[PDB]
């Protein structure tokens, strides 16, 4: 107890103190900093001008025309004007990274206010000759840093298991980090393609350090205590027991029981349900692969007619799940997924620019190389778009109605190809294991050392 | 500082560079280069203020502009090399001693901005590029040691950049508002840069492999508010300017970390002050140093020039004296100390070169 | 066949010893590497213990690119022959346990490797 005004005019002196102190005390770490800078300067600048004592650089000496005037009247002075011989430059280029797939990409302080709400206790003590009126005062000359309550709260202010510090933890919080942050679509942590995390459906199917992992490991094992000792390490049969009693893009569907019918996303989507969606084994909607024994580029194979590429998890039968060491295989519809592009040389166009020249002979209808980029939305190609067009010319090219992939800052060679309206070269997008993929391929047959170019406008149409 | 003379080039074009050769015997007289239109121009300094014309190369090409320039030497012959680059992205080694352009290297994919020798080998030359990136040539071996940009490197032109007294680290600065450090004394760098001397064409058939540094070892947007047009190392320190009117002295972290312990994550800078000026407000603009690092010089858009004493306590106390002449009233693009000091050269929109002398 | 060709991450001019070996048979470029282990350290969420697991992981992941789920016991297989060694030194051998019991719930790999893995670890952990 002791006036609200008195206090608020503390807050305002105290705060007005401490500022200034620091005012002070950060006014000389500068000035201490300068000088034990420019001792270092010196330090360094006397090796330098050292090293260049031990030189005997020679004097430069003097040779159409040309001429220069003085203005402050001093002699006008002529002397011959040397040509530098001609040199030749390459197309403009700017800079960007090397792809091999697709790449993802979205569109009063702390300090003070403890040591003011201190040195404003100190007086509440002193007083008396951590109090509720102070925070009053203080929200008061800062009304906005928060009220009486948030001050409050403000000033009083993820396990590992391997580690000194391990708990005994849920087993389904052990795991969250694997759980949240992991794609089962293309088997990386914190992956570049896929931005909705995974579905909680699909990741289902005594120290802190043992405790903890007897609870992950029973979600797995469950009562073969036998096998969960095993794994333990530091544990039996036993000991375990007796702890125990005491077109739109591909999005995984799940909706836990119900049908994949018009209500479901991927039915909307108009999309076929993949391997990686969470519904019944026999959905009708599923996608279910081909039976070939080979070839399957051909209106006989269901995959290539549905403008899809094989699925090395359900094509069993044509080659595409088989031979990992290898890009050439008995299927001839996985080229986009396992990368099998054909080798590119890089040089200045023939008509501008730079172009793409392939360095083999290639046969019609044969894939060249997947188109590569960034995948961004609709509204960050706008954006990106504005700026673009200042340059007359653009990478963009759409994916689906969802995503753009846009070569400007990444890529793979194949965007070196120029645009015609009499290519030799078309583009297509793929669905591929669950992903839109561009591929390039050749419209005609071509030959060694030919330049590419198909026609933009076709990609350009998501009209 | 007296002014004590002014100069002008027949072709009327703005002037980017100058640049005094810091290699010049003690005893030669002081030697400095200008860049400008598609020409570059070499001049000897005398007593009572006489400039003496020595050397002039024009492009072959009418359409190269000069950006910059830089003086070097080899190691072998002695000879002073002046390196000079511009707008066609192509950098050519000159040989005043021969009047040959020995060398040139075509690669960049875009203008080149700056050109930067390493403090210590003569050979390594850095330049800045509008393709967004820097590139570390060998110019001994003819050879591409590194390409600093890409995934984390500038998004926009790169318009300046400078080596540290040792030579251990680079600073880059552009149009993305970006300041950038690229250490160079890691063992991958070390690594590529012996392995560049050791690269020997005719003995292989495959090429010299350049490193791409993707990565800085530090980089801030949050210094100045717009393009950074020019940086330069003060110490452990950085020296750098945008164009609203002052050179900001910052360092990476917070203000008792160590430049050299500093973290590619840090997220942290300390702003240790700054030199105000006005009118300065136009792009590519650049201050200079002295070569003892005692004094700061810049020019203005309206032809005032700038020379600040950096012995001192604080940018606050920072002694300021402004040279000034009726006669000059161009946009003064860049300065150029002797390396002793006792000049001071400054060029400028209007084909004009005005030296200042001391004592 | 007839024309100077460059190389397309210098521009550099392409001489006659050839465009025999790709510019980018980069399965795994180089800065696609660091980018991501750069990202999983920004996590201020996560272990520094789970982090060094997921690491490795994605390193090996983009080093042979797997893209089939028929492929992943393979590929958990492969990742302690090959990156065991780095798991036991890190101490990083309970985390990535966490791994295969969470890669297990994806329905990736079965029971008979979420321990002949945990096997074979051990098995090469007493050999040092
Ligand atoms: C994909 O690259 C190709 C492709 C083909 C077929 N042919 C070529 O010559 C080049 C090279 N090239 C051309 C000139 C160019 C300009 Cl004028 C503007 C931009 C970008 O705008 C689209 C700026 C946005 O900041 C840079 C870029 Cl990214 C470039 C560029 O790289
Ligand atoms: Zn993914
Ligand atoms: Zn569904
Ligand atoms: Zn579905
Ligand atoms: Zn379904
Ligand atoms: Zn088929
Ligand atoms: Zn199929
Ligand atoms: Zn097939």
Same mark, same amino acid.
């Given at each position: 107890?002791?006036?609200?005004?008195?206090?608020?005019?503390?807050?305002?002196?105290?705060?007005?103190?401490?500022?200034?102190?620091?005012?002070?005390?950060?006014?000389?770490?500068? $000035?201490?900093?300068?000088?034990?800078?420019?001792?270092?300067?010196?330090?360094?600048?006397?090796?330098?001008?050292?090293?260049?004592?031990?030189?005997?650089?020679?004097?430069?000496?003097?040779?159409?025309?040309?001429?220069?005037?003085?203005?402050?009247?001093?002699?006008?002075?002529?002397?011959?004007?040397?040509?530098?011989?001609?040199?030749?430059?390459?197309?403009?280029?700017?800079?960007?990274?090397?792809?091999?797939?697709?790449?993802?990409?979205?569109?009063?302080?702390?300090?003070?206010?403890?040591?003011?709400?201190?040195?404003?206790?100190?007086?509440?003590?002193?007083?008396?000759?951590?109090?509720?009126?102070?925070?009053?005062?203080?929200?008061?000359?800062?009304?906005?840093?928060?009220?009486?309550?948030?001050? $409050?709260? #403000?000033?009083?202010?993820?396990?590992?298991?391997?580690?000194?510090?391990? #708990?005994?933890?849920?087993?389904?919080?052990?795991?969250?980090?694997?759980?949240?942050?992991?794609?089962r679509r293309c088997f990386?942590?914190?992956?570049?393609?896929?931005?909705?995390?995974?579905?909680?459906?699909?990741?289902?199917?005594?120290?802190?350090?043992?405790?903890?992992?007897?609870?992950?490991?029973?979600?797995?094992?469950?009562?073969?205590?036998?096998?969960?000792?095993?794994?333990?390490?530091?544990?039996?049969?036993?000991?375990?027991?007796?702890?125990?009693?005491?077109?739109?893009?591909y999005?995984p569907?799940?909706?836990?029981?119900?049908?994949?019918?018009?209500?479901?996303?991927?039915?909307?989507?108009?999309n076929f349900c993949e391997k990686f969606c969470?519904?019944?084994s026999?959905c009708?909607?599923r996608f279910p692969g081909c039976r070939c $024994?080979?070839?399957c580029?051909?209106?006989?194979c269901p995959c290539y007619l549905a403008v899809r590429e094989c699925d090395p998890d359900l094509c069993l039968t044509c080659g595409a799940a088989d031979?990992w060491?290898?890009?050439?295989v008995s299927c001839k519809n996985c080229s986009i997924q396992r990368?099998?592009?054909?080798?590119?040389?890089?040089?200045?166009?023939?008509?501008?620019?730079?172009?793409?020249?392939?360095?083999?002979?290639?046969?019609?209808?044969?894939?060249?190389?997947?188109?590569?980029?960034?995948?961004?939305?609709?509204?960050?190609?706008?954006?990106?778009? #504005?700026?673009?067009?200042?340059?007359?010319?653009?990478?963009?090219?759409?994916?689906?109605?969802?995503?753009?992939?846009?070569?400007?800052?990444?890529?793979?060679?194949?965007?070196?190809?120029?645009?015609?309206?009499?290519?030799?070269?078309?583009? #297509?997008?793929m669905m591929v294991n669950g992903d839109h993929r561009?591929?390039?391929?050749?419209?005609?047959?071509?030959?060694?050392?030919?330049?590419?170019?198909?026609?933009?406008?076709?990609?350009?149409?998501?009209? | 500082?007296?002014?004590?003379?002014?100069?002008?080039?027949?072709?009327?074009?703005?002037?980017?560079?100058?640049?005094?050769?810091?290699?010049?015997?003690?005893?030669?007289?002081?030697?400095?280069?200008? @860049?400008?239109?598609?020409?570059?121009?070499?001049?000897?300094?005398?007593?009572?203020?006489?400039?003496?014309?020595?050397?002039?190369?024009?492009?072959?090409?009418?359409?190269?502009?000069?950006?910059?320039?830089?003086?070097?030497?080899?190691?072998?012959?002695?000879?002073?090399?002046?390196?000079?680059?511009?707008?066609?992205?192509?950098?050519?080694?000159?040989?005043?001693?021969?009047?040959?352009?020995?060398?040139?290297?075509?690669?960049?994919?875009?203008?080149?901005?700056?050109?930067?020798?390493?403090?210590?080998?003569?050979?390594?030359?850095?330049? @800045?590029?509008?393709?967004?990136?820097?590139?570390?040539?060998?110019?001994?071996?003819?050879?591409?040691?590194?390409?600093?940009?890409?995934?984390?490197?500038?998004?926009?032109?790169?318009?300046?950049?400078?080596?540290?007294?040792?030579?251990?680290?680079?600073?880059?600065?552009?149009?993305?508002?970006?300041?950038?450090?690229?250490?160079?004394?890691?063992?991958?760098?070390?690594?590529?840069?012996?392995?560049?001397?050791?690269?020997?064409?005719?003995?292989?058939?495959?090429?010299?492999?350049?490193?791409?540094?993707?990565?800085?070892?530090?980089?801030?947007?949050?210094?100045?508010?717009?393009?950074?047009?020019?940086?330069?190392?003060?110490?452990?320190?950085?020296?750098?300017?945008?164009?609203?009117?002052?050179?900001?002295?910052?360092?990476?972290?917070?203000?008792?970390?160590?430049?050299?312990?500093?973290?590619?994550?840090?997220?942290?800078?300390?702003?240790?002050?700054?030199?105000?000026?006005?009118?300065?407000?136009?792009?590519?603009?650049?201050?200079?140093?002295?070569?003892?690092? =005692?004094?700061?010089?810049?020019?203005?858009?309206?032809?005032?020039?700038?020379?600040?004493?950096?012995?001192?306590?604080?940018?606050? =106390?920072?002694?300021?004296?402004?040279?000034?002449?009726?006669?000059?009233?161009?946009?003064?693009?860049?300065?150029?100390?002797?390396?002793?000091?006792?000049?001071?050269?400054?060029?400028?929109?209007?084909?004009?070169?005005?030296?200042?002398?001391?004592? | 066949?007839?024309?100077?060709?460059?190389?397309?991450?210098?521009?550099?001019?392409?001489?006659? +010893?050839? /465009?025999?070996?790709?510019?980018?048979?980069?399965?795994?470029?180089?800065?696609?590497?660091?980018?991501?282990?750069? +990202?999983?350290?920004?996590?201020?969420?996560?272990?520094?213990?789970?982090?060094?697991?997921?690491?490795?992981?994605?390193?090996?992941? /983009?080093?042979?690119?797997f893209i089939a789920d028929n492929q992943?016991?393979?590929?958990?297989?492969?990742?302690?022959?090959?990156?065991?060694?780095?798991?036991?030194?890190?101490?990083?051998?309970?985390?990535? /346990?966490?791994?295969?019991?969470? /890669?297990?719930?994806?329905?990736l790999?079965?029971?008979?490797?979420?321990?002949?893995?945990?096997?074979?670890?051990?098995?090469?952990? +007493?050999?040092?």
């Amino acid at each position: 107890e002791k006036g609200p005004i008195c206090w608020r005019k503390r807050v305002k002196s105290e705060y007005m103190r401490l500022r200034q102190l620091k005012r002070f005390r950060r006014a000389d770490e500068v $000035k201490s900093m300068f000088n034990s800078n420019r001792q270092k300067i010196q330090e360094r600048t006397e090796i330098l001008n050292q090293e260049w004592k031990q030189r005997r650089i020679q004097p430069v000496h003097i040779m159409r025309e040309c001429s220069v005037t003085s203005d402050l009247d001093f002699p006008k002075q002529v002397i011959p004007l040397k040509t530098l011989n001609a040199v030749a430059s390459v197309p403009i280029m700017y800079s960007w990274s090397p792809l091999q797939q697709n790449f993802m990409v979205e569109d009063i302080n702390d300090e003070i206010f403890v040591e003011l709400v201190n040195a404003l206790g100190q007086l509440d003590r002193r007083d008396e000759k951590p109090s509720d009126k102070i925070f009053e005062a203080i929200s008061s000359m800062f009304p906005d840093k928060g009220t009486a309550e948030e001050l $409050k709260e #403000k000033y009083k202010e993820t396990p590992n298991i391997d580690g000194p510090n391990a #708990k005994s933890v849920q087993r389904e919080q052990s795991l969250h980090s694997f759980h949240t942050l992991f794609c089962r679509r293309c088997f990386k942590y914190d992956c570049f393609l896929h931005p909705f995390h995974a579905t909680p459906n699909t990741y289902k199917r005594w120290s802190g350090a043992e405790a903890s992992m007897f609870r992950v490991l029973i979600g797995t094992y469950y009562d073969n205590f036998c096998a969960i000792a095993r794994l333990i390490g530091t544990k039996t049969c036993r000991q375990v027991y007796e702890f125990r009693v005491k077109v739109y893009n591909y999005q995984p569907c799940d909706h836990p029981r119900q049908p994949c019918d018009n209500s479901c996303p991927c039915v909307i989507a108009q999309n076929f349900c993949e391997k990686f969606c969470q519904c019944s084994s026999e959905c009708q909607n599923r996608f279910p692969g081909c039976r070939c $024994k080979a070839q399957c580029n051909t209106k006989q194979c269901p995959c290539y007619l549905a403008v899809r590429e094989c699925d090395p998890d359900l094509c069993l039968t044509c080659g595409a799940a088989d031979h990992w060491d290898s890009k050439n295989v008995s299927c001839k519809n996985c080229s986009i997924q396992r990368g099998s592009k054909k080798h590119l040389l890089l040089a200045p166009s023939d008509v501008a620019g730079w172009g793409i020249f392939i360095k083999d002979p290639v046969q019609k209808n044969e894939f060249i190389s997947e188109y590569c980029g960034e995948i961004i939305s609709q509204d960050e190609a706008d954006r990106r778009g #504005k700026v673009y067009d200042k340059y007359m010319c653009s990478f963009l090219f759409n994916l689906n109605n969802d995503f753009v992939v846009d070569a400007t800052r990444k890529g793979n060679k194949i965007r070196f190809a120029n645009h015609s309206v009499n290519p030799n070269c078309y583009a #297509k997008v793929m669905m591929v294991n669950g992903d839109h993929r561009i591929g390039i391929f050749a419209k005609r047959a071509i030959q060694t050392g030919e330049e590419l170019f198909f026609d933009y406008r076709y990609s350009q149409a998501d009209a | 500082f007296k002014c004590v003379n002014s100069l002008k080039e027949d072709h009327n074009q703005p002037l980017f560079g100058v640049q005094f050769n810091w290699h010049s015997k003690e005893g030669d007289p002081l030697v400095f280069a200008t @860049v400008g239109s598609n020409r570059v121009t070499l001049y000897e300094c005398h007593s009572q203020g006489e400039i003496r014309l020595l050397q002039s190369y024009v492009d072959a090409d009418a359409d190269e502009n000069f950006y910059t320039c830089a003086w070097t030497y080899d190691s072998n012959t002695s000879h002073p090399l002046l390196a000079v680059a511009g707008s066609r992205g192509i950098i050519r080694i000159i040989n005043p001693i021969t009047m040959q352009c020995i060398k040139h290297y075509v690669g960049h994919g875009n203008a080149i901005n700056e050109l930067k020798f390493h403090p210590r080998d003569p050979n390594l030359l850095l330049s @800045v590029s509008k393709d967004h990136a820097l590139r570390l040539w060998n110019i001994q071996t003819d050879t591409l040691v590194a390409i600093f940009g890409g995934v984390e490197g500038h998004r926009d032109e790169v318009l300046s950049a400078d080596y540290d007294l040792l030579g251990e680290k680079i600073m880059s600065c552009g149009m993305d508002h970006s300041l950038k450090l690229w250490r160079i004394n890691s063992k991958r760098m070390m690594n590529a840069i012996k392995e560049s001397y050791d690269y020997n064409p005719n003995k292989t058939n495959r090429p010299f492999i350049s490193q791409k540094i993707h990565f800085p070892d530090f980089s801030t947007r949050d210094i100045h508010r717009n393009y950074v047009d020019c940086v330069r190392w003060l110490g452990d320190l950085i020296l750098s300017k945008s164009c609203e009117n002052a050179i900001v002295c910052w360092k990476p972290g917070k203000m008792e970390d160590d430049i050299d312990k500093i973290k590619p994550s840090e997220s942290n800078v300390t702003i240790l002050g700054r030199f105000d000026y006005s009118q300065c407000d136009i792009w590519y603009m650049r201050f200079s140093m002295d070569f003892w690092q =005692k004094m700061l010089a810049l020019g203005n858009q309206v032809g005032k020039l700038y020379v600040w004493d950096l012995e001192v306590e604080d940018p606050h =106390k920072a002694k300021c004296t402004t040279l000034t002449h009726h006669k000059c009233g161009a946009a003064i693009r860049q300065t150029s100390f002797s390396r002793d000091s006792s000049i001071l050269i400054a060029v400028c929109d209007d084909a004009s070169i005005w030296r200042w002398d001391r004592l | 066949h007839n024309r100077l060709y460059f190389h397309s991450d210098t521009c550099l001019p392409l001489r006659p +010893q050839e /465009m025999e070996v790709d510019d980018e048979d980069e399965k795994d470029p180089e800065w696609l590497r660091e980018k991501t282990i750069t +990202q999983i350290e920004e996590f201020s969420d996560v272990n520094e213990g789970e982090k060094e697991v997921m690491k490795l992981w994605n390193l090996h992941v /983009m080093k042979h690119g797997f893209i089939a789920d028929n492929q992943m016991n393979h590929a958990c297989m492969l990742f302690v022959e090959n990156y065991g060694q780095k798991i036991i030194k890190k101490n990083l051998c309970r985390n990535f /346990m966490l791994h295969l019991v969470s /890669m297990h719930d994806f329905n990736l790999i079965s029971i008979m490797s979420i321990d002949k893995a945990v096997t074979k670890l051990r098995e090469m952990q +007493q050999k040092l």
